[PDB]
Homo-oligomer: A and B are copies of this chain.
């Protein structure tokens, strides 16, 4: 319900931006697409009523914590390789 109200405030911001002229209309459109992402996940919660889909959804929510720890370890290894590759292959770079 609080994610619902956050995505209604976001829709209000997107509508207020869209009802003006350019370049704010495209910004309102960009907000509309993030809203469509949220409403598909709200459809996942609506699937939560079914006797098999519901436990599946909270099972996914339980494995998010293990996913986060995997993300942390992958983040350390990923920036180590990325910084090493970018720092070797591009020696003369300006701050950007």
Contact = CB atoms under 8 A, between A and B. Distances in A.
Interface in A64-93: 69, 72-73, 76-77, 79-81, 83-84, 87-88, 91
Contacts of A80: 36-37, 40-41
Given A37-B80, A80-B37, A80-B40, A69 B53 contact: yes
Contacts of A29: 87-88, 91
A45 to B, nearest CB: 10
**Main SS of the interface on chain A?**
helix
A49 interface: no
Given A29-B87, A33-B88, A47-B72, 17 more contacts: A30-B88, A32-B87, A33-B83, A33-B87, A34-B84, A36-B80, A36-B83, A36-B84, A37-B81, A40-B79, A41-B80, A43-B76, A44-B73, A47-B76, A53-B72, A56-B69, A56-B73
